[PDB]
Each structure stands twice: as C-alpha cells, then as structure tokens.
C-alpha cells in the first residue's frame, strides 16, 4: 500500500474504421503543483501498439522499463521477432493486466490506469483498459480519470456502439479526440495545454505526434462576466 | 438460523430450518443446514455457511481415511475432535462455526458433540444453535423425555423449529428432519414452514394469537 506522489491525469482513446487513436497530456503533477511539464505518457511498443498510462509516474516509469524489457526478451531466439512472432497489442495488454492484478493481490499495487491501444496482426483494432485493481474492460471509447467523465460522453457521440466504428474516419476521430483534450484543459485542474497523440492505423502504421497544443480556445466571453450576483461594475 | 439435535431412546433427532439471509434480504429459503458427512454421521450448519460446508465434508474425507486405515467405524468422539482440533488451529483467523456432530456407534451409542469455532467441544443430550435457538429450546425443554418414540421425537424436533421459524425473523423457509440410528441416518423430508404452520395451528390448537 502506498500513495501516488508524482501523477499523470487523463488518457483518452477511441476506435475508428482502420485503427485506434490515443492521447494524453505531458504533465507530471505533484499534488496541486504542476511540477513537470515534459512528461511523455504515451509509450509505443513496436510499430503496432501504444500504451497510455495515467496515475503514479514512478510506477509508469517502472512499467515503461518492463515493456522495454519485454521487447528485448521477445527477440531472444526468435528469428521472426520482426514478423509473425512480433509482440501483439493483445500480448502486451494481457501481460500488464496479469502484473497489475498480481500486484493488487499482494496489497502493493502499481498506482495506475492504463489503456493499451493498437492494431492486431489480422488488422483488428485493439483497445482495452486496466488499472491498479487489475480491473479490465474494452469499449469503442476508453478514458481514464477525468477523461472518463468528460471525454467519453463526447467521444461516444461519434462512436456510440460497435456499428459506428466502420463509419468513423481517422479525420473525424482525431478531431473528436483533439476537442476532448481542449475540454479537459478547460475543466481539469491537473491538466496541461501540451499533449501527445498517437494513431495506430492498419494501413499507415504508427503515427506518433509530439508537442501538440490545445488551440481555438474560447475565453473572450469572460470580459462580460462581473461579480458573483449583484455587482455591475 | 435455527438448528437443533437431541439424544433419545431411538437415537438422535436432527432438525434445522432452511433460511439464509444477508442483512434483511432473504438470500435463500432452500438452504441445507444438515451436512451429510457420511451415511452414519451428520453435522449442522450455523455461523459461517462456507466454513461449515467446507470443513465438514473435509471431515467426511478424514473419517473415510480413518476407517480405511483402521478397518473400523470412526467414533463420534474421534470424528468431532478432528473437526474441533482443526478449527482450533485457525482460532483468531475469523472462522465462524456452531455445529452439532451427530452419530450412533456400538461403543458410544447415540452421541452429540457441539463443536465451536472458538475451539469448544461439548458432549451433550440436547443442543440448539442459531439466531432462533432460544425459541426451539423452550419447546424442547418442556416436552423432552428419553423414552420418546421415534414418531414423537421427530415431531418435537419439527415443532421446535417451527416455534423458532415463527418468532425469529432470520429463521424459516422449511424444516429438514433427520433420524440417526446405529445403522445410519434416515432422512425424514423437507417441510415448508408456511404449510406446516397452518397445519400445526389447526391440529394442535396452538398459535391462537395468529389469525388463520
């Protein structure tokens, strides 16, 4: 049993017709102190998987090393390490899910919420969630922390069920994600303007976008707001 | 819960209710509170349902191993003490158990051992365990005799569970009856309390307070 110290906030994600998108801001908070502004919380594994992690950053870094070690280990005595016997998103997830549940069962959890986003060998979209309790679930849209409350409602308006996935293009999906990130910046006190976004497409592969910013923000209406009730000036 | 067991001329009567509750919610009305350890030994289920179920069928395994090794029926004393010694090892861990280990052997005759998760092991003639135990004790104490017939003893056990089932909110559903003889136990049926109550009320003239 511990308490999280340096933390990362929402990870948001969704499926679209040819793959998955995942995004997460670059902030490492220290309580209310916005301590670290250059933290990458999307960690790619190979060219077919991106693991998004929120919660305790020290535990994130540990998980990051496990995944790095996993790639090394898979390559051992494996002539098809970059082909048929490459790591799948489903392998990477199941491994993490095992670790998370084992650690909660020893009463010493990795204080995280994780979303594994990727594309399988047969082109199938993979998107599944796991957290410090070892709880797992899959859905056309997945989000951690504040994202669950604010991003999901917006992302679900695009893909409300399984049948909406083939109707959703990468442009529409990315637009919805980027908008959700803006909304989280407005409303999550532990978020930052800077974020990273990763697209894993079955045709165009892994596109990893760094140093993105929330833009097209509405603030002008603030000038007209005065006092808290009766004040006019 | 209400469970009882008493010794008499014709052996042992074991009688239990059938209700299981989680708070005020009635989880089940068809629970088996008599564990059939083997064809000769019976155990009652009060306190922790799992703890009673698990460890008394385990007890059946130990009793089976005993008679394979010793080529002889295990005594009720020995069988009860296997269970009591086991739970005593777990003392503090939070096992919850209140059971009567019932059997009828040559050397002992009809024997009842009250075994407890605190490690208590008591031999006795009449035992009553559960939330409705006090109600069943009343009927038992005032009507019990050693020279009861098997028919009257069975009815007494049934009636004593009914007395508890009526008053105790956490007892009811149905009554399970067993008669333990030297040649083994004999099951004497499941008796719905709802139907039994009205039947007993009319035939016995009891429960005048209740309108039927």
């Amino acid at each position: 049993t511990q308490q999280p110290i340096v933390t990362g906030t929402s990870v948001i994600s969704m499926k679209y017709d040819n793959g998955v998108i995942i995004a997460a801001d670059n902030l490492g908070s220290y309580g209310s102190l916005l301590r670290f502004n250059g933290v990458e919380r999307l960690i790619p594994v190979g060219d077919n998987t991106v693991v998004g992690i929120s919660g305790d950053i020290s535990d994130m870094q540990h998980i990051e090393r496990l995944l790095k070690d996993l790639v090394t280990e898979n390559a051992y005595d494996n002539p098809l390490a970059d082909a048929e016997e490459a790591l799948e998103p489903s392998y990477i997830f199941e491994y993490l899910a095992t670790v998370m549940y084992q650690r909660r069962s020893k009463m010493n959890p990795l204080w995280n919420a994780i979303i594994v986003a990727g594309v399988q060998s047969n082109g199938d979209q993979f998107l599944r969630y796991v957290n410090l309790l070892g709880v797992t679930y899959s859905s056309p849209t997945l989000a951690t922390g504040f994202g669950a409350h604010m991003a999901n409602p917006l992302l679900r308006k695009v893909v409300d069920r399984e049948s909406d996935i083939p109707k959703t293009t990468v442009q529409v999906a990315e637009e919805a994600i980027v908008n959700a990130m803006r909304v989280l910046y407005y409303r999550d006190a532990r978020s930052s303007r800077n974020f990273s976004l990763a697209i894993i497409d079955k045709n165009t592969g892994l596109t990893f976008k760094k140093n993105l910013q929330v833009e097209n923000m509405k603030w002008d209406f603030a000038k007209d707001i005065k006092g808290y009730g009766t004040q006019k000036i | 819960t209400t469970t009882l067991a008493f010794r008499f001329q014709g052996g042992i009567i074991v009688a239990v209710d059938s209700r299981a509750t989680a708070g005020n919610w009635v989880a089940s009305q068809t629970v088996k509170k008599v564990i059939e350890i083997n064809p000769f030994l019976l155990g009652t289920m009060a306190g922790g349902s799992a703890d009673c179920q698990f460890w008394e069928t385990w007890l059946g395994s130990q009793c089976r191993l005993h008679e394979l090794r010793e080529k002889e029926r295990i005594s009720v004393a020995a069988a009860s003490k296997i269970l009591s010694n086991l739970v005593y090892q777990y003392k503090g861990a939070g096992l919850s158990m209140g059971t009567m280990i019932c059997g009828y052997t040559r050397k002992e005759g009809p024997t009842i051992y009250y075994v407890d998760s605190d490690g208590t092991r008591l031999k006795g003639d009449i035992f009553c365990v559960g939330s409705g135990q006090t109600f069943a004790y009343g009927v038992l104490d005032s009507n019990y005799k050693w020279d009861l017939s098997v028919e009257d003893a069975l009815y007494l056990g049934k009636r004593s569970i009914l007395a508890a089932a009526h008053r105790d909110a956490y007892s009811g559903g149905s009554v399970n009856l067993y008669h333990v003889t030297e040649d083994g136990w004999i099951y004497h049926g499941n008796h719905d309390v709802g139907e039994l109550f009205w039947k007993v009320k009319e035939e016995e003239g009891s429960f005048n307070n209740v309108i039927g």
């Binding site: 409602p153 908008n179 409303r187 209406f221 009766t230 | -």
Partner: protein, 226 residues
Amino acid sequence: TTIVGVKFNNGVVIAADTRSTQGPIVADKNCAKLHRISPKIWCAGAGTAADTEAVTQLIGSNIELHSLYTSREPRVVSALQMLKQHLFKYQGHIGAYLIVAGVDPTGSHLFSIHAHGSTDVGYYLSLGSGSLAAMAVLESHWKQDLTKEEAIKLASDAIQAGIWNDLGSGSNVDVCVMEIGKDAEYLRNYLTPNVREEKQKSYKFPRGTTAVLKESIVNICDIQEE
C-alpha cells in the same frame, strides 16, 4: 441529476433530466426538477431533493410577498440574494444546489448556487452528478449570440449527455424558456427518448388467485343522520 442553464440572444433557458434516485434504485422515472420561484424566475435543483424543493418554495413565497409589497415584478438577484443568505446561515446543512434563471425588468439572468451559500455568474452552467457530461457538451458547442432555437438544442443535448453517460441521470428532458418581454414557457417532457419497450408477457392474474381471510366494508363516510 443533470441540470443545465444556457443564456441566449433575448433570454435564458434551463433544462433537466427526470430521474430521481434512492441510492442505486430509481424512485421516480419522471421527476419534475424544474421549479418555479416566480412566473418568470425558474430554477433547477440537485442534491437533497427535499432541500431544493423546500428552499425554492420558501424563497418563492417571500419573493411573491416582496413583489406585492413593492408593486414590482420580482428580480432574479433578489431570489439569488435570499437563497444564498438562507443557505449560508445553515452552513451547507441544507443540501440545495441550484441553477437559477429568469427574466425581469433589469434583463435576463443566469446564476448557480451551492449549498454553503456561494454563487456564480455565467452564460452556460451545469449542476448535479451529470454536470461533467453536460459541461463537456456545453464547452464543445457553446458560442456567443445563440438564438432561442440553438440554446434549447444545446441545453437538451447537454442533458442528454448526462442521461446516457451518468447513471444518476436518466429518462426524459424537461426544458423551460424564459425570453424577455414574453411569458416563460415550461416544456414538460420536451424529449422522451426512454420509453420502456412492451413486455414479453402480461402478468394480469386470474381473479381469486390471492388467498383471502376476511372482507369488510370500510366506513369512510361521516356519522349518518336518523
């Protein structure tokens, strides 16, 4: 509960879902959360349901008496000031969380009020367990100079976000539109996207199925003549 308030061109609109719950159980599937403080000042409540209904009636009553005394139509700021000073006095023990909206001779207004007595001004607001789902929609689609038809659309879309995504919210969308120089129009069950499907079976019993002990006529009438 999901409740929202949205300012527009010539007035303000409030909206709410229609699910009231006791823990995880749905007590009423068509609750009326839009309350009237005065003809053109309406409010929606979240938190302790008795406290919201009770505090709106009390202020609504004192507002009416104040209106009669002053020979002037009631103002939203008066309802606001009376609500907050009452709630503050009770230090949050009255668990009323309100979005107050209305029109008066001063103009159109939109405020929120929290149980400890703090108030806030805004062009768009949301309260309740589905407030985050609703606010996401409001932050995504709100703009300046909304029309009446756009504001109703936005408000109800925000409530829907709560209905679908928040377990504390559900059933229908109630809306009330308060426009300047007009009667406030209360639109009860403006949307009905959660009608229960026909059951597979009828559970009407044969008559005489229930066992009966005694029948008797109950005397509800008064003591009779003669």
